[PDB]
Amino acid sequence: DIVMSQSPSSLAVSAGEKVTMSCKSSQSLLNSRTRKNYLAWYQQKPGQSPKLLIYWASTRESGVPDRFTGSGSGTDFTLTISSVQAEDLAVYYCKQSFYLRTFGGGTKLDIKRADAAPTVSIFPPSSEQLTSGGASVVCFLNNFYPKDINVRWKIDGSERQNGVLNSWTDQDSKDSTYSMSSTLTLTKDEYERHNSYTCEATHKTSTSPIVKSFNRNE
Amino acid sequence: QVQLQQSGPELVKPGTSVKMPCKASGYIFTDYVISWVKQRTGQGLEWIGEIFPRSGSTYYNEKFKGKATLTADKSSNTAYMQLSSVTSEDSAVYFCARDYYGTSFAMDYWGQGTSVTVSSAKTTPPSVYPLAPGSAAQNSMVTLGCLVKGYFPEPVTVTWNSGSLSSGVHTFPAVLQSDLYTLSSSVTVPSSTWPSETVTCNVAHPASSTKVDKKIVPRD
Amino acid sequence: KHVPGGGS
Ligand SMILES: OC[C@H]1O[C@H](O[C@H]2O[C@H](CO)[C@@H](O)[C@H](O)[C@H]2O)[C@H](O)[C@@H](O)[C@@H]1O
Fold first, then answer.
1. Domain B122-220 carries which CATH code?
2. Across the interface, do C6 and B105 touch by the CB < 8 Å criterion?
3. Are A47 and A102 in contact (CB under 8 A)?
4. Where is the cross-link described as Glycyl lysine isopeptide (Lys-Gly) (interchain with G-Cter in ubiquitin) (chain C)?
């Protein structure tokens, strides 16, 4: 069985730059009679099925623009993307079809762009939710770069570290930014024991956190 | 145009069998191979195996022998994959794909995938809550949202003003806590346009037949 | 017939 090794595991490049990625097979994928390498490249964007880009190591599939180029032969293969666009963020898989089928583990392509501080918003629980006995407080940290971010919750100034559920979007193809949601869920009874609720975001764009707050009493 | 039509998401109980269809059109069914690929949420592609509908012959990734059974029905142009005695290990998206057998041996057309969740837990509708800014002045843009809480299984979808609000929308991936999913969606509009023009999230959880519209109203 | 890949 043929083992496929892709490197690097991920790559970050600016829009307009050239990216290169490697795919190696444990055995030659070249058949001498047919004279072809049985090696294909697939692109998978978030929430989509994989798409064939290149087969026979270097033949571009229908409709694929020439800025995607496959090269190599035998056990050593490369995918080049020139003039990388924001819309190219995807995981790129190689796959051998010499004998059975084996996918490489993928190279994830991320886009570099200018740093951007998050736009932070806090939302007190709804009347609807509170009437039913629950109290979720939500904080959005929108359109930031780079992806690394810290969020801390404070209840009357004391850090609160559970009942917290965080979720992070894929990098956005429209602007190459990231976003995050942080939700603090309490009972209504616990919620009514405290006044000020605070979400604080620490991002490399500033040494001081971005603080957003509301008071249950207003 | 070539097309492979797969069935929608399935919730199945542990220990049962699930059989999923892959209905081919736009080409000669008996001239191409159908292959099947597994993808766990957030993970890579894994080859299951393939069937050549011309002959009915199969090949498999050794890992899937006696887990996957591939068949095909020439008269309906449909390929099937059956998974036996499922466990949570089998929860994954399963793609079928057309393999250009004999020339490229490449998967040139792919189905949309059938999402299988293997769980004994019951289907639960979501609670849908508005996210509106506190009545205490928080500039030129305002961010609103929808909290979609306590549902099972995936997926739900969220749109804003029935799709007509498209820009400035972030819908976050669902997170699983105690056998229930929660997600939120954010939307950003010019602060002049709200609340004078209405903003409404349209939430759908097809598994529980939920279709909810939540109007975002200003607080107090 | 029905070979396992292009190597065949
Ligand atoms: O403590 C949980 C994890 O936190 C980090 O990763 C999360 O947050 C990142 C943003 O700072 C996201 O990019 C990532 O998707 C999240 O998983 C940390 O990097 C991880 O090692 C922790 O497991």
1. 2.60.40.10
2. yes
3. no
4. 1
